[PDB]
Symmetry: D2
Subunit: 317 residues, 4 copies
């Protein structure tokens, strides 16, 4: 049986006997994603170039507008906005959503894969909504995932029931369920990080990478891949296995990537797929945020690979 | 004034007083690229999944390019990554051009939705003999045209001819390649290096030292950043766009590198050179290598002249 | 605020305190219509003409398959199928769907507008599902409408709340609401029938048409339009006002159009928009079917026009 | 072998050893036709309806700008512009083009099939380019045809070599040759006019239509079809055979349809396909225009059908 994103979610909803609010929310986001995908693949560019005689801002506008009009949200956090957005009282629903509408776009000039990342929370206070409703640990996520605009557009959705991947068929504008209850490999053969920053690495990251290129057990070295776009690298980590690293060094003690709308959703996807995501000190999903725009170290991927990194981290103390 | 690929090539043709053969071939190629782009983006995948109750993409891409080029009436010899032997176009469909192409580069990893691409190099037949595989055995210096299609966040066609390098965005809403960057030139010097460092244990000592210089600059400047998509078209396009260096060098295990000379290395070297960049094997210019086999491998270091010169300084140090 | 067919039907469902079965049915149907649209507009036709070296059957398979897999239906009646299709027990839901998956495909060779027509009923008994579950008068309809594959693809949906029109944006594959709670003009200025068959006309049809062309008063004669594709002619009638006729004559005493999947859904759309739909003798919606493929005469559109037709009809009764 | 519009045209040009200028013109026109098809099918409508928070004018702007930028044209006559457009000297080429950028669009509110009609002449005079250069008889056309935005988008091209039909594959944005050297049927079985004007018909049209409905020879009566959109009506006539009529009437004493960019192109297509196009008095292609927006009555289609009407017209003087 063919299945689609809308139908899949709605059927998980009907089981949980939900009110439809989360289905509405995910439907609207699905809509914004298709619209972002379309702008990203350059439909309409001919008009900009004079046929008849901004992208990350468009992407933010689409997500922001679609989530507000879903009547399922109350607080909206985005990379694009300094403060949390509070949904006008009339359009207010029970969920908080933290998103990065066009992750990777600093390098979209070279047509690198880009993505939208999102994490969904239930609001915490009956008390009127605020930016504080967004300051929750990843452990509280109701759902999370990303759209990848790579060679094709895929939406990866993580929920209680697991992680499921939906391909956008642009002939019909529908997300088709193609990979079910996805689980990451126990151990992969690829590591992924900016090695250009070698000089600044933590000694525990230095020794780990050393172990990948020069294996102490005489096994075959890991390959290295690093697109420089997080959704792309993380997606490859899910599909193929291995490890993705954006770690802390003494110059950036809290990494560079953003906890709420980058590290948490990816860590939640990872955990639902049987993988792991650590900061080094603790699970990313355990960190309790105080700033919506705070940064986090992130090491994620295959369980045996992350545990291997953690054993080195522990050694260096 | 808005410009399209067809209009751009046609106009260059009139300046040169051409018969029209190269324009027809580039039009057919660009029809193929759009059909490839559509299949790569998964148009109609819903039918594979039972929406109403088959070919792999590299096979389909090969069939698309092959069939479109044959039917162009502009070609006589076709060399593809996918076929062990050169295809000799039947007599009724022959033109004067020899095309070397990789129909879907990087597709080995297309399961993770990595950027893929098409690469092509076009030669005029030299000999007056019946066409054969030898007609494809020309150094890169003889290229008439070369370029690539990148199926990335968007689909862009990068074309190199004598007039220089021009970048055409595919507008999927209308199926037209729109000229969006004209006569493109690479940075003199970049800040990104690109290789698979996972195989560092097998590097040539010159590569080890070069990479060491990038990560730990003796002149104490800021290090270079690192990127490696692991898809040649992706990596080479970023190098053109942002500058820096792309390396797939020879080593002890692989003394001729891995990438293919005719339909990966040469087209990309030609594009780099027409954009003011460099491309070397370490010992020679990529475009100067005379092939003896159509599926032969070359080492390739390419990118910003200052960055490639710096690799060559280190290379020379180690002989 | 932007609205889509899914978000819209779902708001209606929450209002009505529904389980969501009908929304699932309508989402599935929507997915089918997008796939028909793409096919009808000839996406991928290059592959049939050898670039790399039937539409009525496909349309039927798209609708049947999406409906079965909706878990919302139990009996499916199609123009294409001799007998009613009974859904497998594990896939059964509460609704009966009567449809014409590609109406007008007889002349698709000339690229005439084509369409999909559907009518949704609730199954009325707890019996084992059979053809008889489809033998309901149009008054029993829960929802009905049509997709028109015209210069654009539009979906017109009638429910208790009235008639709403959704444009398919092919860029993103969403049905966008563009006309809310539509009502037909009280009187139009267009008549629509095949005048080539005038020697077979009912003397009443003869006189009515005569009056439109040669009015007794000083009024301008009506204009004439006849696409010959029902969805196109009925939609122009909804949009512009006027009258559409496929009436009985001596040779065909029950007309040519099919009651369950052509006449009834259009009668329902017409009546929810404040229009009328008669066989000449009674409302189309009141006819009790005894056969799934039985024919009905239909005269429909603006009420002043249909009432005027009935006046002439009675004159000869 | 698969053929495309660009490749077909360019091969015809090489046979005739032409400069390439007519190819440049026709490529530019086809690009415009793809952008019109995309706008007409409502790509991007979601943005109009606020997802991120005029058609005939755009269609005009598309054909104008693309034809100017071809370097192939010197004088442009459009339905949308009161006067001929004189191409600036730097963009001037040898062809004059008369076109209707979106024909039938006054009724597009009901998603009626629309189309683009074009007629291409070589500038005949050696004078400075002026409106006069557009006033040549249709006999002088070098090429003509239409894009029909119907259930699918098809470009129909008439040149010296015959009539060729190319379907737009929207998945790849390419016009594919589907029907080669097209010839109309010698006699058809459908007649096509607005019979709402029956009161204004002169005796010849009246007798002819009466003949179609009540065949003197006891042959089968003709079917009637009238979309009310010329491109749709004419294309069906080309595809199925039969006859299309838009005669003069009280409101339109010189006919309704425009000679330069409606009647001439269609008459040219008809004639290259072995059909016929008449005003009643003379071939449409023989009319020598005096004014760019002037109207002509038109009767066109299958040769035996036009001949039969012409025997009737003769009877009535
Ligand atoms: N029926 C018909 C249609 C069209 C014409 S026409 O007058 O427009 N003539 C043609 O269409 N002639 C054939 C087109 S030839 S295009 C001339 C431009 N030359 C060209 O592209 N040469 S090339 O060898 O392909 C070339 C391309 C690019 C470069 N850089 C160099 C050479 C008449 C009748
Ligand atoms: N006019 C009309 C239209 C439709 C109906 S109906 O019978 O079909 N009813 C509805 O459409 N009702 C809408 C409310 S039920 S739809 C969703 C089921 N709930 C749900 O998804 N809840 S959830 O909280 O969002 C949820 C989502 C995902 C998970 N995993 C868990 C819960 C009648 C009349």
């Amino acid at each position: 049986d063919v299945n689609t994103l809308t139908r899949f979610v709605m059927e998980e909803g009907r089981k949980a006997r939900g009110t439809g609010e989360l289905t509405q929310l995910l439907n609207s986001l699905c809509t914004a994603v298709k619209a972002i995908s379309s702008a990203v693949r350059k439909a309409g560019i001919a008009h900009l170039y004079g046929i008849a005689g901004k992208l990350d801002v468009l992407s933010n506008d689409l997500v922001m507008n679609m989530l507000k009009s879903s009547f399922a949200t109350c607080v909206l956090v985005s990379e694009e906005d300094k403060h949390a957005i509070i949904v006008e009282p009339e359009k207010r629903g029970k969920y908080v959503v933290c998103f990065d509408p066009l992750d990777g776009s600093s390098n979209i000039d070279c047509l690198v894969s880009v993505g939208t990342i999102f994490g969904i929370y239930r609001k915490k206070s009956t008390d009127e909504p605020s930016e504080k409703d967004a300051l929750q640990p990843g452990r509280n996520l109701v759902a999370a995932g990303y759209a990848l605009y790579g060679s094709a557009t895929m939406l990866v959705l993580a929920m209680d029931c697991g992680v499921n991947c939906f391909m956008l068929d642009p002939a019909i504008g529908e997300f088709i369920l193609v990979d079910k209850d996805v689980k990451i490999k126990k151990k992969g053969k690829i590591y992924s990080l900016n090695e250009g920053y070698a000089k600044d690495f933590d000694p525990a990251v230095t020794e780990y990478i050393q172990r990948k290129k020069f294996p102490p057990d005489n096994s075959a070295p890991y390959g290295a891949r690093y697109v420089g776009s997080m959704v792309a690298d993380v997606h490859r980590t899910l599909v193929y296995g291995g490890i993705f690293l954006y770690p802390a060094n003494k110059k950036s003690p809290n990494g560079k990537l953003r906890l709420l709308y980058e590290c948490n959703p990816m860590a939640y996807v990872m955990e639902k797929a049987g993988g792991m995501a650590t900061t080094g000190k603790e699970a990313v999903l355990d960190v309790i945020p105080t700033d919506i725009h705070q940064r986090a170290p992130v090491i994620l991927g295959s369980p045996d690979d992350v545990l291997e990194f953690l054993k080195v981290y522990e050694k260096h103390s």
